[PDB]
Amino acid sequence: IPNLDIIGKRIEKIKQEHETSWHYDQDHPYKTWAYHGSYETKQTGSASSMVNGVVRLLTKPWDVVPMVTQMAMTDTTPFGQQRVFKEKVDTRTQEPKEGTKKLMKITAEWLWKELGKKKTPRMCTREEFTRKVRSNAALGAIFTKWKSAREAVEDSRFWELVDKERNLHLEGKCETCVYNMMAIWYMWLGARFLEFEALGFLNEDHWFSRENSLSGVEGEGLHKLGYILRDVSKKEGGAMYADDTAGWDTRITLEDLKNEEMVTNHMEGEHKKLAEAIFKLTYQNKVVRVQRPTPRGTVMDIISRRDQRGSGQVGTYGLNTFTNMEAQLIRQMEGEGVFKSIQHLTVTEEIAVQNWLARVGRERLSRMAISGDDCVVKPLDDRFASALTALNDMGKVRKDIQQWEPSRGWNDWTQVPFCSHHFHELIMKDGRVLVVPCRNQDELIGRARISQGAGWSLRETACLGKSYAQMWSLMYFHRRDLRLAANAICSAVPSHWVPTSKHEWMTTEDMLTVWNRVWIQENPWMEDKTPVESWEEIPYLGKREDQWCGSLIGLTSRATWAKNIQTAINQVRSLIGNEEYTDYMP
Ligand SMILES: [Co+2]
Numbered sequence: 001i002p003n004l005d006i007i008g009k010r011i012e013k014i015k016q017e018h019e020t021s022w023h024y025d026q027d028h029p030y031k032t033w034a035y036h037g038s039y040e041t042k043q044t045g046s047a048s049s050m051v052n053g054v055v056r057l058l059t060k061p062w063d064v065v066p067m068v069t070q071m072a073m074t075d076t077t078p079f080g081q082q083r084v085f086k087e088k089v090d091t092r093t094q095e096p097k098e099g100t101k102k103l104m105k106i107t108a109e110w111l112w113k114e115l116g117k118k119k120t121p122r123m124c125t126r127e128e129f130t131r132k133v134r135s136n137a138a139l140g141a142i143f144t145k146w147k148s149a150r151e152a153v154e155d156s157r158f159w160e161l162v163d164k165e166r167n168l169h170l171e172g173k174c175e176t177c178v179y180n181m182m183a184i185w186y187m188w189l190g191a192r193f194l195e196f197e198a199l200g201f202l203n204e205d206h207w208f209s210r211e212n213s214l215s216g217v218e219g220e221g222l223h224k225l226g227y228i229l230r231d232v233s234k235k236e237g238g239a240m241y242a243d244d245t246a247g248w249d250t251r252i253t254l255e256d257l258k259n260e261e262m263v264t265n266h267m268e269g270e271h272k273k274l275a276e277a278i279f280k281l282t283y284q285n286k287v288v289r290v291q292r293p294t295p296r297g298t299v300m301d302i303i304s305r306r307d308q309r310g311s312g313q314v315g316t317y318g319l320n321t322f323t324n325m326e327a328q329l330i331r332q333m334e335g336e337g338v339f340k341s342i343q344h345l346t347v348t349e350e351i352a353v354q355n356w357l358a359r360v361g362r363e364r365l366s367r368m369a370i371s372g373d374d375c376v377v378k379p380l381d382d383r384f385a386s387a388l389t390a391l392n393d394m395g396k397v398r399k400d401i402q403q404w405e406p407s408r409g410w411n412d413w414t415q416v417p418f419c420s421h422h423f424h425e426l427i428m429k430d431g432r433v434l435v436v437p438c439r440n441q442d443e444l445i446g447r448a449r450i451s452q453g454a455g456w457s458l459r460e461t462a463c464l465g466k467s468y469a470q471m472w473s474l475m476y477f478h479r480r481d482l483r484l485a486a487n488a489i490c491s492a493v494p495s496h497w498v499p500t501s502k503h504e505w506m507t508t509e510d511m512l513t514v515w516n517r518v519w520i521q522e523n524p525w526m527e528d529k530t531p532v533e534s535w536e537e538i539p540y541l542g543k544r545e546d547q548w549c550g551s552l553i554g555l556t557s558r559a560t561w562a563k564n565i566q567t568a569i570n571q572v573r574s575l576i577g578n579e580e581y582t583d584y585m586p
Pocket residue numbers: 016017018019020021
């Protein structure tokens with residue numbers, strides 16, 4: 001049921017821009033989204049992402065690995081947009097029960113107060129926004145008008161439009177903040193600025209760093225997460241649990257959005273009203289355009305919904321972390337028996353929850369590592385595994401397990417999945433112990449073989465390959481195939497070309513210098529600061545184990561690849577052209 005007093009102004013402006021073709025399509029497919037109308041549009045998107053020809057030429061054995069090549073096959077055409085919508089986005093999560101709602105409000109109020117003890121909400125500025133625009137992903141949709149975000153921020157007319165929308169937000173109205181599905185949702189840059197202005201502080205001021213949030217890992221980096229998992233495992237308690245949620249963003253409820261909004265209770269002045277506009281007008285009452293193929297050509301559908309979360313927003317990461325922290329705390333409460341029924345919370349139970357949060361709240365937060373929808377929890381004991389009523393009633397249904405089957409955890413932290421990795425102790429030649437990340441190698445190579453844009457020059461393609469190679473040399477040096485592949489890419493691309501997207505692999509610094517900085521000098525879990533003097537000193541995983549986040553070391557095709565790698569390197573060099581290359585292949 002749509003509230004036209006909040007969304008009608010947005011819908012009418014779109015309707016007036018397409019009055020001739022605007023119509024209600026009685027054959028529309030939307031079930032749990034409110035459908036408003038359609039108009040004729042030009043099809044956007046493509047049914048395949050571009051392959052990185054440099055990386056591909058240097059990773060020939062993986063041409064026949066289906067896991068690798070399947071990753072290249074995206075579909076952003078109207079046909080492709082409707083599949084993902086039908087499968088993932090067109091669902092409904094039931095409203096939580098009264099007791100669940102009271103648990104969430106109490107916990108969320110407590111959590112915001114903890115996060116705000118040492119932080120103060122503030123407004124982010126146009127200059128902050130303009131500086132970040134001169135970098136990358138703001139996730140704006142630029143359509144018929146500017147050509148890029150860098151061109152828009154320089155134009156004075158652009159900020160006049162922002163001012164017009166901002167003034168409307170100040171009077172509690174919204175007219176241009178519309179989501180576009182081209183599942184990832186885009187907005188026009190002015191709508192992104194208004195959200196960044198109101199909520200960017202959560203990221204800019206590191207509200208979910210581990211120091212400030214205890215559970216969060218914002219800013220940590222892959223080379224630190226394994227150490228953080230190992231520290232959590234040192235706590236007394238039950239097994240470590242890491243349940244994935246099925247389609248987290250689609251399971252964010254209106255109740256969740258309202259609890260995330262209580263961060264406005266910590267705000268003042270026009271900042272509070274601006275953030276309240278973002279929450280009520282654009283998060284809890286969203287208008288979405290999505291393309292749909294019809295026998296008569298592509299149409300754009302205008303649809304709306306209150307409850308879900310739009311992937312790619314400014315506060316998406318932080319608010320997902322907030323709500324997951326809140327959800328996992330409540331599951332810890334349920335396991336410890338702090339309340340007994342989610343149908344309603346007795347006044348005695350409500351005081352018990354409040355006392356539990358005051359007594360042990362911060363300790364229980366430190367038993368968790370949470371990044372967006374990704375969580376690891378080491379609870380007090382294993383009652384957690386079957387404490388499922390609040391989690392299911394909040395809509396956070398676990399993936400790949402029956403609704404009421406108890407969760408299975410791990411007693412060995414090196415088996416716990418987190419941020420799509422597992423983490424291992426790696427013994428150096430001098431006896432020091434690294435905790436390194438491991439991920440399936442086919443997935444790593446498949447992602448490096450994907451070019452991010454369309455119509456990229458060979459130089460930008462080569463610099464993206466170099467960026468992957470250097471990330472591999474810093475994060476996955478312990479995998480035989482990736483160290484070799486990284487060396488080949490860096491030998492094939494001119495040494496002075498800059499890798500193209502903050503992260504430590506994004507310069508032309510000597511990668512051994514960066515390795516020493518990351519893993520030794522600035523590594524707080526590395527007491528002996530003696531640096532290593534060569535790559536030969538830096539070890540691999542066991543040859544049995546290395547093979548098995550995906551390696552091919554035992555294969556005939558890999559042995560041939562490794563032996564003739566210089567031929568492929570020379571081939572790439574002949575295309576970039578006469579240039580100055582460094583040989584990294586020892
Ligand atoms: Co018209």
